[PDB]
Design a protein around this ligand. Structure first.
Ligand SMILES: [Cu+2]
Ligand SMILES: [Cu+2]
Ligand SMILES: [Cu+2]
Ligand SMILES: [Cu+2]
Ligand SMILES: [Cu+2]
Ligand SMILES: [Cu+2]
Ligand SMILES: [Cu+2]
Ligand SMILES: [Cu+2]
Ligand SMILES: [Cu+2]
Ligand SMILES: [Cu+2]
Ligand SMILES: [Cu+2]
Ligand SMILES: [Cu+2]
Ligand SMILES: [Cu+2]
Ligand SMILES: [Cu+2]
Ligand SMILES: [Cu+2]
Ligand SMILES: [Cu+2]
Ligand SMILES: [Cu+2]
Ligand SMILES: [Cu+2]
Ligand SMILES: [Cu+2]
Ligand SMILES: [Cu+2]
Ligand SMILES: [Cu+2]
Lengths: 295, 295, 295
């Protein structure tokens, strides 16, 4: 796109504030930002806030979100679809023109680990170019295993294709498949979907800890066979809903847009790979590392 | 196939009648019928009754089906495999020659949303050419959420490939992926697997209604990441068995031949897309629309 | 690989012995062995013990495994990752050099049907060349349906690609997709992943029996839509964990590395195909047969 030539918009922080016991304001941008998705490979991503996947959003069950999108793209319209919410897509997930803002309000009444993404036609194009992310809705009564958990992180799986190439998007295999981590607490890493960062700077944990991961596979196109090497998932909550409880799963099947909360114990010091077990995808980037130390 | 050149057999209604408290007769044809699968694109489908997917069958749990297939194909043998039933495949799912009929009897003792399809070798060929459909077996004691449901529809996902091309069938990506709807009550639409009809003539509902969809992904080859935009599934019953209860799912993973019953609430007026969230497939046709009005 | 030219190492039996109430010794090899994966097609597989998938391992819940790998490959390092176990991957799933042995110890504290495989980088290469298998961990308290089961078998799904071709492994469709069976009791068949053996020598059963299959889809890359023609799964335990109970499933979605225990009734004499319902894969080999007789 001629109007994207030379465009690299610096990342903008997510803006979020609570405005009542059950109401939260969220402000995001749609912007065009160079991301190093593999060593030496820059993708001029269509993004929320200059991150792909986008910034993490965390709300409580029963929060109404008053969402603003500021569209910094000089020429492409953008929008927002939160899977967490009940909304009219044709009224509430509508386009915001270049250099304009739009505000939309809707309730998140279901707990879980939900995909968000741009909903501008063609949606495949907007997702594949990078406009995806996760919103976590925390359950009013927790998870039955909350007391057992020592440490938590968020991981997101996505693919990258040939740049802005709709033929490849629809008919081609992914060039890269990648994990990223998004921060829940201060000092947690916050990364983009790339083939290397979580190998070179592993997630950290202590020997003996029960780890919770909030996970979502945003696609756009592939399913994920989520697995942590050297452990077994003690508990799995499909879509992060507490009712959808499985136990003792080696591998969690995630549809495209599918999420889960998974919990597992790391019993011994070492580095534990985290993979999609569809190994072609793993080979093309989708391996993260968890480094487990005696401290 | 030379003997299919110029052949376009007009659709024949499904014939069905109950013959006892636990016995039903079903009569279908195998026939060769031109279907417009995308605008301007005619596929000379191998079909049951001139529809692809085929006509909807609905029986009660515990019904024995006395099934007749009348094969109108001038040259290809056809057969029928109902996933709902317990049967000897080598006795009961056998070929019916051109211009002949065959009758087969077997029990449907399990509730759910089951695939049917031709079982003639090579089965990939017969399915990919259009010989698939759904049979619903209604549970003797219902679903625990029956009282909450205001409106119901059936949706079926399938793919289309290059015409009768076994290399493409086995090794190629789908050309189109599509939804169709099959009527449960008078006035419901009844459509074929195409890229457009359910966009141009959306399914209808009223603001505030809880909608049930009976869904199956007949493939032949892809899995489906079933999602309704702007809602969350309140309840999901895997394969339509009441025991396989999930709650609060954003997206339902369906294997090839996989079914579900899903329920969700439409809270606001508008048009709600229904997709497989594998967006390459969505782009290639697999988006239906639900239009929600104040009436 | 020049050092594999002309190499065909005869299969070596699995060595296994119990050494205490909760401890078992297992000795396997990594070796290079010609396998006929389709009629006329020899693949010089990288294997455990000259079988691909490898030999079946069965332990009890709570057994500690003292595992030895003897690496007979003249030039490639190999390793072992059991999904059943809690282990440090960077200490316990490490490489064994050509002509050396290594011993590793770790607990199997979770019941189920678990993948094992070589964990040597690039793991896609080692898995795709044949270094995969299943370990069954029997639950201390059984399955609630144990008393109903008349007969049991193990089935494993895997793919084969162009020989040792990492481009094909990562970017290509499978050449073949196959089932194999591995023996649980004397007289059970024990086969390799091929397109024909389980068609030509079907698994056997008696009319009216409830059959249990322990199943795993080892990939490397595809998911599986597991289905038995002419029946419905009465009970399904995801990953073989007794808690992950589904009922009345026509088809079981398995991620890559995913397992299950499935139970179904064969009501009538005949031959019952067993398929992945992703029919492109079925066409390329993934159909096994169960022959059901009045004896
Ligand atoms: Cu309150
Ligand atoms: Cu506000
Ligand atoms: Cu956009
Ligand atoms: Cu979406
Ligand atoms: Cu792909
Ligand atoms: Cu702890
Ligand atoms: Cu574990
Ligand atoms: Cu009766
Ligand atoms: Cu009759
Ligand atoms: Cu047919
Ligand atoms: Cu079938
Ligand atoms: Cu495909
Ligand atoms: Cu209502
Ligand atoms: Cu909803
Ligand atoms: Cu003991
Ligand atoms: Cu020992
Ligand atoms: Cu190896
Ligand atoms: Cu593994
Ligand atoms: Cu493939
Ligand atoms: Cu019995
Ligand atoms: Cu059955």
């Amino acid at each position: 796109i001629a109007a994207h030539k030379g465009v690299n918009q610096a990342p903008v922080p997510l803006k979020m504030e609570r405005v009542g016991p059950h109401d939260v304001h969220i402000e995001m941008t749609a912007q065009i930002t160079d991301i190093e998705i593999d060593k030496g490979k820059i993708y001029k991503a269509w993004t929320f806030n200059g991150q792909a996947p986008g910034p993490l959003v965390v709300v409580n069950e029963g929060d109404t979100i008053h969402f603003t999108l500021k569209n910094m793209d000089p020429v492409v319209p953008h929008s927002m679809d939160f899977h967490a919410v009940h909304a009219s897509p044709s009224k509430d997930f509508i386009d915001v023109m270049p250099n304009k803002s739009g505000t939309f309000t809707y309730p998140a009444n279901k707990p879980g680990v939900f995909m968000y993404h741009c909903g501008t036609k063609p949606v495949l194009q907007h997702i594949a170019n990078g406009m995806h992310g996760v919103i976590i809705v925390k359950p009013k009564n927790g998870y039955p295993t909350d007391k057992e958990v020592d440490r938590e992180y968020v991981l997101i799986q996505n693919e990258w294709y040939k740049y802005n190439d709709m033929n490849d998007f629809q008919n081609g295999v992914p060039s890269y498949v990648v994990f990223s981590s998004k921060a829940l607490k201060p000092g947690d890493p916050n990364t983009n979907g790339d083939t290397f960062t979580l190998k070179e700077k592993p997630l950290l944990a202590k020997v003996g800890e029960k780890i919770r991961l909030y996970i979502n596979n945003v696609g756009p196109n592939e399913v994920s066979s989520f697995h942590v090497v050297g452990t077994v998932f003690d508990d799995v909550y499909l879509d992060g809903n507490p009712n959808n409880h499985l136990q003792g799963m080696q591998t969690v099947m995630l549809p495209a847009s599918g999420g889960a909360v998974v919990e597992f114990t790391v019993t011994r010091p070492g580095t534990y790979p985290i993979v999609t077990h569809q190994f072609n995808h793993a080979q093309k980037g989708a391996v993260a590392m968890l480094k487990v130390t005696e401290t």
